[PDB]
Design an enzyme around this catalytic site. Structure first.
Site, PDB file in Angstrom:
ATOM      1  CG  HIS A 196      -0.484   0.332   2.347  1.00  0.00           C
ATOM      2  ND1 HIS A 196      -0.156  -0.375   3.567  1.00  0.00           N
ATOM      3  CD2 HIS A 196      -0.187   1.643   2.993  1.00  0.00           C
ATOM      4  CE1 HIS A 196       0.316   0.303   4.693  1.00  0.00           C
ATOM      5  NE2 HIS A 196       0.092   1.711   4.062  1.00  0.00           N
ATOM      6  N   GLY A 246       2.835   5.987   9.036  1.00  0.00           N
ATOM      7  CA  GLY A 246       4.072   6.123   8.837  1.00  0.00           C
ATOM      8  C   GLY A 246       4.970   5.173   9.105  1.00  0.00           C
ATOM      9  CB  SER A 278      -0.104  -4.754   6.789  1.00  0.00           C
ATOM     10  OG  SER A 278      -1.092  -4.403   6.020  1.00  0.00           O
ATOM     11  CB  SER A 300       2.950   1.620   6.453  1.00  0.00           C
ATOM     12  OG  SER A 300       1.586   1.350   6.812  1.00  0.00           O
ATOM     13  CG  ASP A 308      -0.190  -3.808   2.610  1.00  0.00           C
ATOM     14  OD1 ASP A 308       0.342  -3.274   1.761  1.00  0.00           O
ATOM     15  OD2 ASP A 308      -0.629  -3.357   3.597  1.00  0.00           O
TER      16      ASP A 308
END
Length: 198
Positions: free
Chosen positions: A36, A141, A159, A143, A63
């Site tokens: 993502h 952030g 994720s 992620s 993801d």
């Protein structure tokens, strides 16, 4: 730029995510990160400098993504923990109840234990299936950032999580946290990647 797990990078001068892990693909340098975080060919920058572009991704459903880096980049077998580092020693997948930490540009290095596996998250864009849950906390952030045991075993990439209105779930007890990561092993085999270890 020195590529370390846990550090900030921007995507097309707009979004921020965290680096997951240094990998190679034949002679190609790359790092794994969350799907993502960007579309294929989105530009990755670290500290204003361009370091590579997204080579492949799958989101939603899964993801996962990897960014292929330019030859100038230095891959390091390390995850940031404050001013110190955790060495990546391999990718043995820990069982439920194992202790684990994660690394990221918004909440830094945080630790908790794996509480469940094969969790579905329902995001705005669609379902992501097969995620592992830990209760280490995280923020927006983070992620893409590394999840790794203190023993150096790489678990996966950050994720999503039940972030509260302050941007993270660090302000609610570990018991109430749901921090989800994508497992590293299917990302490594799906793109034919090898982890950088030390």
């Amino acid at each position: 730029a020195n590529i370390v797990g846990g550090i900030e990078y921007s995507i097309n001068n707009a979004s921020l995510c965290s680096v997951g892990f240094s990998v190679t693909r034949g002679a190609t340098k790359g790092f794994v990160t969350a799907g993502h975080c960007g579309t294929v060919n989105a530009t990755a920058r670290i500290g204003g400098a361009v370091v590579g572009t997204f080579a492949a991704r799958v989101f939603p459903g899964n993801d996962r993504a990897w960014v292929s880096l330019t030859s100038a980049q230095t891959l390091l077998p390390r995850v940031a923990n404050g001013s110190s580092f955790v060495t990546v020693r391999g990718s043995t997948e820990a069982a439920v109840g194992a202790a684990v930490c994660r690394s990221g540009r918004t909440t830094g290095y945080q630790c908790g234990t794996i509480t469940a596996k094969n969790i579905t998250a329902n995001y705005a864009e669609g379902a992501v299936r097969g995620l592992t849950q830990g209760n280490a906390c995280m923020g927006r952030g983070d992620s893409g950032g590394s999840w790794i045991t203190s023993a150096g075993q790489a678990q996966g990439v950050m994720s999503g999580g039940n972030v509260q209105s302050n941007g993270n779930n660090c302000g609610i007890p570990a018991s109430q946290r749901s921090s989800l990561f994508e497992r590293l092993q299917p990302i490594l085999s799906q793109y034919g990647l090898s982890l950088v270890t030390g």
